[PDB]
Amino acid sequence: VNLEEACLERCFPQTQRRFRYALFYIGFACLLWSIYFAVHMRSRLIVMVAPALCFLLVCVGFFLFTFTKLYARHYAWTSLALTLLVFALTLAAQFQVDTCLSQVGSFSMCIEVLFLLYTVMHLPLYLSLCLGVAYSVLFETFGYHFRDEACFHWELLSRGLLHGCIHAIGVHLFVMSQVRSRSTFLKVGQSIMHGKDLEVEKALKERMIHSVMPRIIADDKMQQIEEVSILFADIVGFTKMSANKSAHALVGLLNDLFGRFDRLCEETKCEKISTLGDCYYCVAGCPEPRADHAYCCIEMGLGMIKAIEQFCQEKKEMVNMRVGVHTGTVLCGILGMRRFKFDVWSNDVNLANLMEQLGVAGKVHISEATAKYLDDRYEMEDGKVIERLGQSVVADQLKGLKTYLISGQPPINQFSLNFLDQELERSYRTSYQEEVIKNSPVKTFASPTFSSLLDVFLSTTVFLTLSTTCFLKYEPPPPAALAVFSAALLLEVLSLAVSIRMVFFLEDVMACTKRLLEWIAGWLPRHCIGAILVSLPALAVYSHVTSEYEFPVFTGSAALIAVVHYCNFCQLSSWMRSSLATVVGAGPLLLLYVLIGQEVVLVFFLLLLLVWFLNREFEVSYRLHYHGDVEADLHRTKIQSMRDQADWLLRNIIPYHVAEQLKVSQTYSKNHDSGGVIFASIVNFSEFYEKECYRVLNELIGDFDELLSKPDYSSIEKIKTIGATYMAASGLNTHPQEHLQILFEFAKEMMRVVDDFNNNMLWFNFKLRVGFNHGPLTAGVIGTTKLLYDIWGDTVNIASRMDTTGVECRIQVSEESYRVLSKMGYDFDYRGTVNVKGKGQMKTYLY
Known part of the structure; x- marks a missing residue:
């Protein structure tokens, strides 16, 4: 329940702006109705336009409520308070009805308020549905009981089917609006968690890289750097430490010993190549061409002797160091693709290793080449290896080389509704096409394939129920009515069958229909079939009109829902749906009439503005939802690459049988x-x-x-x-x-x-x-x-x-x-x- 609160506080700016725009629109609806009431309903003015202006002042007060900090805590309560007030105003305005108003005006008041409550108020499902139905059922009850006879079975059923359509569209609109918001918040949460996990694993991979390579090499394949001082040291007495001591205790001693070496190496600012068992050999002067390589190498070498005595006096051991220094040319780089490490290779390195073997415990052994770079800062002692060890096999290859010893010292445009980045916008267009191509399973309620299924299904039930009312009126219907309805029904069942086969993917499918199923999923063909699919309820109403029009109240009332149905198919471009609703869902009635005329123009303008705005809001919700999806996928493919790189470089250091244990200790x-x-x-x-x-x-x-x-x-x-x-x-x-x-x-x-x-x-x-x-x-x-x-x-x-x-x-x-x-x-x-x-x-x- 804590994540639901986290969802609410992050989504609150959307709810606050949605509620605020509702305040603006209701006041605009109240204002425009008042002006029309002032010109054509002058018979009763104070009882009709005063509630409109009073409610306009209420909207300003509600707008003032929005800025208050109390609204942030209880935004649900304020939306509920408005809902009753807007319910009361519309029902009261319907209560009264050159002194008579057409019902189509009242139906717009019922329809527009219903869409505001369901979609733009962020009230719960059970409350919004119950309040909407209760407001709708009381709207119809008041209209039938309070009708006027001076001016004006199956009729009652027609009213329920019409009100059934708007609730079906309303709950469909709000549920998907909720689904996208919850999904967008979640995928944003995963993205921010993936990004945080990326930084902690990018450093882990760099730590793995630094385990086998120095920092300078890691910046980016061999080198011939000369004048490199090579260190070599030996733990004289490890064999004694080998016996009668446990393995874990043994590796613990060397971990602190080499860790002490690593720290002083950092103090020496030199490079540690590797530790060959008890040996610890490190280079100076490569890859960075340092000029003080000899003096650092002498310093750490003596420091190693200084460190071992401190190490001996801490854990009570008896061990020393046999340090060997030889400077000269060297080769650096990497060999191999697995277990590859930085290393140094030359005859100098072997001689430097040999010099360590010719040293004496607790003493730094140096070559004649190293002595050339050494001043009187340290004491010089003769190496004296010939008489110390005799003419042994190890001392044969000294080849006359004198040696010395040392002892110490939202990217969416408001107008065109497109992604600011054109590459993102192109991928968005083909997203439904590729979604069918990869046959991605239906994951959530916001899946593009699942979204189309309900949009087509909603277009189905709206079309039949809206057409059912029109046929209930006639119960000879014109042949144009039957033909259009039959063709619309024929198209509807095939389009519905396409949607279910795109989601369920029955085993009867073959490659032939899959190619055209992918073809339909494209941007242009879907708009070709979708626009007709959206307009299907609209043509259903206009199929029942003939020259005997002069009937008018029903067709206008039914056309109020056909233009309302246009909010469905959120995946389609909002501009095309909004424009088509003006031209094909509202337009045919407007010029057909060509005061009832002034009322209808005002009625449809208010509905079209609400339809235009809701299509605007839900499209950017759908577009932002896809933005959250691609960022989450983009972060997941960046976290898998780092997962593979970190694991591979871990395998570059330790084998398989060591990784699990290091995850424990x-x-x-x-x-x-x-x-x-x-x-x-x-x-x-x-x-x-x-x-x-x-x-x-x-x-x-x-x-x-x-x-x-x-x-x-x-x-x-x-x-x-x-x-x-x-x-x-x-x-x-x-x-x-x-x-x-x-x-x-x-x-x-x-x-x-x-x-x-x-x-x-x-x-x-x-x-x-x-x-x-x-x-x-x-x-x-x-x-x-x-x-x-x-x-x-x-x-x-x-x-x-x-x-x-x-x-x-x-x-x-x-x-x-x-x-x-x-x-x-x-x-x-x-x-x-x-x-x-x-x-x-x-x-x-x-x-």
């Missing part, structure tokens, strides 16, 4: 008893690389991304891509090791397209080493304002070890995975032993 955590991770890197790209070469790399990843869309790889969800390496995981959503089999086929299919893609290259084939290991892994979502899904653990780090110790297009596998891979029947070869941290020399078999 702000943090995600899960441990895995058995989990396989795939690492696939490209070697000969460096030989191919010399930005122009990386475009070929992008389509290669896009070809790899097409492997994920295959129905047989729905259990595999990639994690991310770093450099030329592709990281995929199988078993997160979980034969006990069926995920591994799909993962192995993914790696095999991975080189299959690699060899297939090499066929399109000129004298250059690509390379792909794949590592494989399965076991316990922990995953989770990192960040609050920037989401990030990644998996880390012993199996992940050992998986990357297998790519580093990799060979040509050959799937390196661990002993643990070989325990279950060779059982099924996979043909596997042996290679030997490689260096593995945490397990010593590892027995590595191969595909």
Whole structure:
């Protein structure tokens, strides 16, 4: 009931203006009648024109009531108060009747007041219908009882059918007027709610975009920006933190730790690329060409050491940082269509990663290139990596590069009734045509197809009842009367059958009649049939007139309703209906007469003005209703696009099995008893690389991304891509090791397209080493304002070890995975032993 109040207060300006215009019209009707009463009814003046002028003063008082704040609270009461007064005046004016007035004048007083109460007063259905019928029945009762004999069965039935028509038109007019207003208010409410939901989801999509891309990239496909300082950090001691701590608690610690990193990164105003497990590597100087990149990178790197001690002293941990800095040229951009993220690729990045591996815990490690951009603002210490770690495999490729360490510091025109935007107006014309075309179901009472059904039905019952009274008078009728009525009846039943078939769409329909049914729904053909349909009651009356006219009171009284019937078919243009009513529903009677003559001209002018005005008001109600519909549809198609974009970019960050949980809790955590991770890197790209070469790399990843869309790889969800390496995981959503089999086929299919893609290259084939290991892994979502899904653990780090110790297009596998891979029947070869941290020399078999 609160929304009904909300409907009423929003629609109140319409009701207030509608009531005010009724006040103007009734006073105008009272004034014009008084002038006519003053000239042709001079026999009794003070008893006839004084109520007219007194009621005119009442309208001014009622107009004064409108501005009052009390009227806004009880506008229904004021309309009810006027209704009784206008009822009393018309019945009193009918009470009296060169001293006699024709009834057609009184009938207009009954008709015009009835239309005002039903349509332009916004009173309830039960009150308006009961008051209208009670006023009508008392109008007829007073007329029959108080008739004059000095001047002037089936006759009584004719009066009821005539009054039956106006009430039928009146309730039809008011119900649809109510239906459009309620529908327009609702669709406006949905539109304003859709718009509010659009802003909250447009920001959500931007937040999803910012989770994989920086702000500057999001403004709008690769770059060759040089002089870029690359950070690298490692959580030395995560393996200790890995054991004897719960998964949710574990991801909580890193969420605060990386969140602390994210905050200080914002303080450093640098860019964070991604967090590879415990590693946190971030770039400076790209894509924005910042010149202080080295000094910021040193600052956050030392800040990370400062942050970890604060982090250690808060939740009581024992961990440190191994920071590595190397500046130089770098490549930036996006690879892939799914799980695509901003990343940096160069030999500098690997050396920057290598520098982090050559660092010492709690110390920032820098390159010689970085030292060139560093002044004495910090302390310089010799790197001393050669004697710290000996001549190890990691230290072989330093290639004589000296290194250093750092410790700290309403569009409708009033006249023509058209939409101001011509494109909207054109769509409005074809709306009924396309509504039939799409076969849209009848949703509400304001549907254009349903609206036509009742308009045709109302034109039916009005035409028969109006014609019934005319035939009751004759009970020889002229042949023109029978022929017109039969043709009108023949047209009416076919038009009614068209309306029901346009709504109900019976199974007897075929394509042939559908084409013409759509054809009829067009603007011009509907006006061609509609104008005749509207005029059908009008020609019914004028079919019964002959040369023996000199009969006149009945035809005039019946013609009062034929012009009244013209308010029906609201879908048709109001100007055509209003003009046709003047020319074909009122015109034929006016020149037929050519004081009774002066009275009829005044009577029809008042009715035509009311008919013209009501057609004006209900047309803009219909036009504004369609405006509300198209805006709601326009907002619904804009909310679905944002729905698709936000969901797709959510899939760009987290897989399916994570979206539901993030809808329940702000943090995600899960441990895995058995989990396989795939690492696939490209070697000969460096030989191919010399930005122009990386475009070929992008389509290669896009070809790899097409492997994920295959129905047989729905259990595999990639994690991310770093450099030329592709990281995929199988078993997160979980034969006990069926995920591994799909993962192995993914790696095999991975080189299959690699060899297939090499066929399109000129004298250059690509390379792909794949590592494989399965076991316990922990995953989770990192960040609050920037989401990030990644998996880390012993199996992940050992998986990357297998790519580093990799060979040509050959799937390196661990002993643990070989325990279950060779059982099924996979043909596997042996290679030997490689260096593995945490397990010593590892027995590595191969595909």
